[PDB]
From a paper:
Mycobacterium tuberculosis adenylyl cyclase (AC) Rv1625c/Cya is an evolutionary ancestor of the mammalian membrane ACs and a model system for studies of their structure and function. Adenylyl cyclases (ACs) convert molecules of ATP into 3,5-cyclic AMP (cAMP), a universal second messenger and a master regulator of cellular homeostasis. Unlike the mammalian ACs, Cya is predicted to include only six TM helices, with TM6 extending into a HD connected to the catalytic domain. The protein has to dimerize to form a functional unit that has been previously presumed to resemble the pseudo-heterodimeric fold of the full-length mammalian ACs.
We reconstituted a complex of the detergent-purified full-length Cya and NB4 (mixed at a molar ratio of 1:1.5), in the presence of 0.5 mM MANT-GTP (a non-cyclizable nucleotide-derived AC inhibitor), and 5 mM MnCl2. The sample was subjected to cryo-EM imaging and single particle analysis, yielding a 3D reconstruction of the protein in C1 symmetry at 3.8 Å resolution. The reconstruction revealed the full-length Cya arranged as a dimer bound to three copies of NB4 nanobody: two copies bound symmetrically to the SOL portions of the Cya dimer, and one asymmetrically bound to the extracellular surface of the protein. Interestingly, the crystallized construct did not form a native-like dimeric form of the enzyme, but nevertheless retained the ability to bind to MANT-GTP/Mn2+, with an unusual twist of the MANT-GTP base. The well-resolved structure of the Cya-SOL–NB4 complex allowed us to reliably place NB4 into the cryo-EM density map. A negatively charged cleft (site Ex1) is formed at the extracellular interface of the two 6-TM bundles. The negative charge of this pocket is provided by the residues D123, E164, and D170 of each monomer, facing into the cavity. The ability of NB4 nanobody to interact with this pocket spuriously indicates that it may also be a site of interaction with a yet unknown natural protein partner. The C1 and C2 maps provide no clear evidence of asymmetry in the active site, which we have observed in the structure of M. intracellulare Cya. Therefore, the two MANT-GTP molecules were modelled in identical orientations.
Author numbering:
A (entry chain B), C (entry chain A): 41 to 405, 416 to 428
B (entry chain E), D (entry chain D), E (entry chain C): 6 to 122
Write the structure that this text describes.
């Protein structure tokens, strides 16, 4: 109901400005006679009333305002001369009416314009041009004021309408931009376009290679027993915020966060040759930060980290409550290796060795060999 | 009845003098510009004199310095002094405002003949 | 760059319409003389050129168009009489310019309007009113055409600008509405407003009572071994779509879907007295549908279902990749009872009995007693 | 023979009212949830009403506050009061349980037409 | 003494260029990731650049394509080339590892001012 309010506001301001223009005209007149004054009180009163009575219903009220305007100007112009400037007002109004009325009434609007034109061709001929009523000069000043008012009314009304339109656009763009930013945060951009379409299809993407890291907390049930639930949720949020910012720095992706468990995936939105190295370095950094960060109890929070690597499948499932997801054998391997991983350590398999031994340090202990860290030498 | 009636035309020798008078009813002359027009037959009528509201006047090149346009408010009339009259000025003279001028709503004018008799 | 294109389009169409109007005027003139024709070729050519040369840079080009317009009309009007109608054009232009130029140049625009007014007061006085050039009547037709053109140009230009604005609004509203619908689908409405704010705070909500249902697949690793991964993902999506629609029918909420596991929560967005009954009935219906639905292999897909009840905590955590979540002891109970549940059966504890025995059927076998189903009698 | 037969559909003007009845043989309605479904042609049939075992009901957003789902145990039937009927509701209406709903084992439904005649 | 000292900040016009240097004592840069941070006052300090052990780097969206993060092992230092500088980048710049980043154990940074003088 916004197109509404644009129309109604411009009509109200237009009525106010015309009344203001007419009153100055009014006081200026001297020895002009009250045969005009009787019509003149009527015109001013009706113009002032229509904005106060613009509830009665429908589009008939704005049209009644114009009926009054046309009748008033015709009546004044007939008695006075053509040189006064009744001619210029009809021309302003012809352009103004189309702006005032909405698009579904364009045809009607066009007719109104024609009606105005029909008067003007008559106005030069039928009206006795230059019928002079009392002082002459005073009609000098009337013509000049007519020109200036005809310009100013149109300028102000047009500018006001433009202001409403631009401003509605501004609030609009902000209101949309916030939601778009949130959606962009929630999901990768490419898949968002696929979601938006009304156009239902399965999203399945096959990826030759990828790597998954799973991290979990130890003895969380303990720490829950001795702490209030509300405080515990805050602690979890703090921890995961730090982890999220580290991830965003490394450029890797996290699909989801489930309770204690934290999941990271490398290279599915885009493949890269060195995904495994990046994941290993990120895991080392995460262990450092975790051994750092502190819980309300004051005990350190150990984390078990398991890494797996292999092909994966990505895409949403369901018809409701979507999220990016991932799948593959590597996920099973990662969940396993995290589950059996010791406190404060990182566990990886025969594969993850092939790729990380050249380029990182692992040893000791399917068979699994612990990931110490990166090589000091460079 | 918005009308303009001319008068003062007639018969005269080359080099004589006339005063064509124009009286209008239905309008106010003080707030109107104004023109004196004239038809021979070889053309539509070609404007020879014009006087505005404010006192300014102008003339056709063929006639300037010879015919004078003047006014009477208390009257609501306009006059054309005419001097140095000649066979080319033998014509039929009208009087108007631009609005009637362009709408075709005109009087009969007044005849002016320049010849020896 | 859309405000852009509105401005530029209206300018181009305006130039086209003025040229079209001028050419008809042009051909109509007879025995008018070529002293005018020389100016007249210049005006028409420049008007036609400016839309083709509107690249040169900046706001100087649209202003140059108006400089040409003013000079041309002043020059024509001086020679011809005032009654021709040079006066009406300046008045149309005064209103039109404000629309043509943007808001950051409003002040300049206002000045232009004043400039036009400055001419009009001069135009009546300075110009020799009613200088007549060849046939008289022909100037009749000129004045009438002047009026009609002055009306029509303004009407068309205004309507065209309004059309652009309304239409931009339409595409806009659609483009925003799709994203809003997706976001509404993803998360409950109330918490979405809390997310949207720039305004960072923890979201923790304490709920006195709630109930959780966990459902899981049996031997999914098998079925994965003998089936292609791509087909397996499609099967999962089909199953979860059916389950989602059943849930939406029952009115309950599902927080997330993780691999085989399916989680449903009752009564957290709004508490209700009979949440447990609703959850039990929903579980029975889900078992029916699951025993129905069929996998690619053709073997039935059994499901293990465990239900728990108790207080819970709800809210997002992290700083990235949010989703609604839930927490509490009931979640531990539910995960446990699902894990130990037998194939094709529903398992519930001493609590869930208190509330469901009066009103449902349970028995046999912390201690747990299997949920047969609902009482036949009514 | 596990079957559900619909009835009560037919011809009516915009804004009228209907009562679609659904009777099932082969099952017990008291221990079953239940849904009213409807096909136009632009889609598969979209669930508009649902009533559970226990009395709970739910509706599609396009229709809520206008159609009412109610029950009859001693019968083994379900009814759909329908109010404020309109051209969008002109459709072909079915009635089912989720099991038959998902297995495709359905009746013919009942026709409902909203138009002036 | 595990410390990181910044340097190279100062005074410059819009569109100029800087090179902020970061030297650390107490650790080995080759085995560490790394970040450049910056505080205006309207917020805590928001990470604009990050370089990992292995050569990978990333940037905030507001700044990408303009500032470059580079390294010096034989040094144990990190550098931030900065281009296309502007009033929004007038800030106070810090340099760290994630561990110190999260523990609050930081230096004073270096001031960078973008304005005409
Ligand atoms: C070849 N493997 C697959 C190919 C395509 C799609 C899925 C799989 C697959 O192996 O899915 C399994 C996990 O990756 C997948 N999965 C588990 N956790 C996650 C997870 O956290 N994220 C993703 N994307 N998938 C997960 O669940 C599925 C079952 O694992 P569970 O731990 O739930 O045990 P179960 O096999 O169902 O037997 P049981 O529980 O009855 O004893
Ligand atoms: C009093 N309990 C809580 C109060 C506030 C916040 C969380 C809890 C809580 O118990 O969280 C646990 C699950 O609800 C919560 N949780 C598990 N699955 C889910 C889940 O699917 N959804 C939600 N919202 N929470 C879950 O994880 C947490 C740990 O359970 P795990 O199964 O991961 O085992 P563990 O205790 O970490 O020991 P271990 O794995 O090292 O052997
Ligand atoms: Mn866990
Ligand atoms: Mn599972």
């Amino acid at each position: 109901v916004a197109r509404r309010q644009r129309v109604l506001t411009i009509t109200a301001w237009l009525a106010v400005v015309v009344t203001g223009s007419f009153a100055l005209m009014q006081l200026a007149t001297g020895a002009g006679g009250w045969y005009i004054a009787l019509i003149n009180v009527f015109t001013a009163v009706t113009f002032a009333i229509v904005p106060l009575l613009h509830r009665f219903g429908g589009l008939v009220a704005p049209l009644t305002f114009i009926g009054t305007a046309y009748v008033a100007i015709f009546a004044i112009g007939w008695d006075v001369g053509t040189d006064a400037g009744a001619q210029f007002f009809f021309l302003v109004a012809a352009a103004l009416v189309v702006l005032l009325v909405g698009i579904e009434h364009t045809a009607l609007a066009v007719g109104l314009a024609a009606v105005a034109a029909g008067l003007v061709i008559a106005l030069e001929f039928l009206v006795p041009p230059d019928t002079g009523l009392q002082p002459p000069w005073a009609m000098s000043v009337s013509f000049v004021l007519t020109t200036v008012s005809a310009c100013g009314v149109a300028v102000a009304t047009v500018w006001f309408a433009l202001r409403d339109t631009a401003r509605a656009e501004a609030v609009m763009e902000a209101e949309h931009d916030r939601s778009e930013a949130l959606l962009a945060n929630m999901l990768p951009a490419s898949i968002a376009e696929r979601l938006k379409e009304p156009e239902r299809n399965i999203i399945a993407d096959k990826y030759d290679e990828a790597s998954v890291l799973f991290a979990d907390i130890v003895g969380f049930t303990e720490r829950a027993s001795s702490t209030a639930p509300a405080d515990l949720v805050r602690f979890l949020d703090r921890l995961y915020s730090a982890f999220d910012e580290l991830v965003d720095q490394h450029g890797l992706e996290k699909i989801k966060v489930s309770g204690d468990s934290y999941m990271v995936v490398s290279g599915v939105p885009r493949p890269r040759p060195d995904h495994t190295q990046a994941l290993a370095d990120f895991a080392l950094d995460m262990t450092n930060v975790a051994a750092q960060l502190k819980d309300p109890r004051g005990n350190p929070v150990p984390l078990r980290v398991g890494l797996a690597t292999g092909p994966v499948v990505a895409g949403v499932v369901g018809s409701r409550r979507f999220f990016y997801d991932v799948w593959g054998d590597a996920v099973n391997v990662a969940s396993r290796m995290e589950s059996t991983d010791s406190v404060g350590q990182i566990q990886v398999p025969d594969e993850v060795y092939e790729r990380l031994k050249d380029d990182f340090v692992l040893r000791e202990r399917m068979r699994t060999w612990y990931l110490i860290g990166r090589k000091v030498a460079a | 009845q918005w009308q303009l009636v001319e008068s003062g035309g007639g018969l005269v020798q080359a080099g004589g003098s006339l005063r064509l008078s124009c009286t209008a009813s239905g309008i106010i002359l003080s707030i109107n510009s104004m023109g004196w027009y004239r038809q021979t037959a070889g053309n539509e009528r070609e404007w020879v004199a014009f006087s505005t509201a404010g006192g300014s006047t102008t003339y056709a090149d063929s006639v300037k310095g010879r015919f004078t346009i003047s006014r009477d408010n208390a009257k609501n009339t306009v006059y054309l002094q005419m001097n140095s009259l000649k066979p080319e000025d033998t014509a039929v003279y009208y009087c108007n405002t631009p609005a009637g001028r362009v709408g075709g709503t005109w009087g009969q004018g007044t005849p002016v003949t320049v010849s020896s008799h």
